[PDB]
Design a protein around this ligand. Sequence first.
Ligand SMILES: OC[C@H]1O[C@@H](O[C@H]2[C@H](O)[C@@H](O)[C@H](O)O[C@@H]2CO)[C@H](O)[C@@H](O)[C@H]1O
Ligand SMILES: OC[C@H]1O[C@@H](O[C@H]2[C@H](O)[C@@H](O)[C@H](O)O[C@@H]2CO)[C@H](O)[C@@H](O)[C@H]1O
Lengths: 138, 138
Amino acid sequence: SSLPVPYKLPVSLSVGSCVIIKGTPIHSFINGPQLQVDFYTDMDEDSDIAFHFRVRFGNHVVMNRREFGIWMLEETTDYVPFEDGKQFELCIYVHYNEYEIKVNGIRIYGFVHRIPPSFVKMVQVSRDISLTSVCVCN
Amino acid sequence: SSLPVPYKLPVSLSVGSCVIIKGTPIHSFINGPQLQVDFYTDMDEDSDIAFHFRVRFGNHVVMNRREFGIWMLEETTDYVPFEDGKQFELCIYVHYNEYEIKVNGIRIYGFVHRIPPSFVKMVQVSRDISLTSVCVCN
Ligand SMILES: OC[C@H]1O[C@@H](O[C@H]2[C@H](O)[C@@H](O)[C@H](O)O[C@@H]2CO)[C@H](O)[C@@H](O)[C@H]1O
Ligand SMILES: OC[C@H]1O[C@@H](O[C@H]2[C@H](O)[C@@H](O)[C@H](O)O[C@@H]2CO)[C@H](O)[C@@H](O)[C@H]1O
């Protein structure tokens, strides 16, 4: 891996920002690897989370937020077009209303803001992946 | 322009970071356009500047830093391989010792750190350019 995992990147996001994460799962899908991305409101890992994204590869994706320390209503989707053993490209685009989530160019979900994305001060990429690059674009 | 100019982007830089700026001069070279990039230590434009980069297109590049509010010893180079009227790509790579500056893939200079690059909290892109994209990569 080019970057350490868990990878905690201080960020400032606004509408129009784009988070691009490139990496590879470190296990085959029959071994149940996961990939987690958290849009944290501070560097402390107990802080509130504006957007939590957790892929169980070849299985499903769980999404949520954490407000006042409490997990809210979980959202999910079965569309997880990652490929076993291959590098992936995960793009999270900050729209005025939602985060649009693309997996290898394929839009899979829009997670609607319950707090403004400018509250996000850190992005953490974690679990069973090797990280090639993380880029924040405007 | 896709982004407003002057463009002030809050950032957190470390060794291995890469700032990629894509844009076009808004005047032809006989009209003396300039492009300025400042690696500021805070959002206030009077704060200290770890790295100041000022291109007079078709002419020369001035580089400096500002410490305790005082401009230090100016550095310069005559190599400015920008093309009249064309989009450029300016990459600033944060090495452990220096910022390596590439213009359209061409390394033109290495500005050595006099304060650690982790002191940089804002990048400002300014003057006579239209801005297509700014990306911070790791
Ligand atoms: O919602 C994301 C959040 O879920 C936690 O696990 C949940 C679990 O998904 C749910 O099925 C069960 O009923 O409650 C658990 C805890 O509230 C994870 O612990 C957490 O890391 C997030 O992934
Ligand atoms: O050094 C960068 C800094 O220069 C200022 O202008 C200088 C000028 O380049 C120099 O030739 C003259 O002798 O002193 C000036 C001020 O110290 C710019 O004003 C400033 O914006 C930076 O570009």
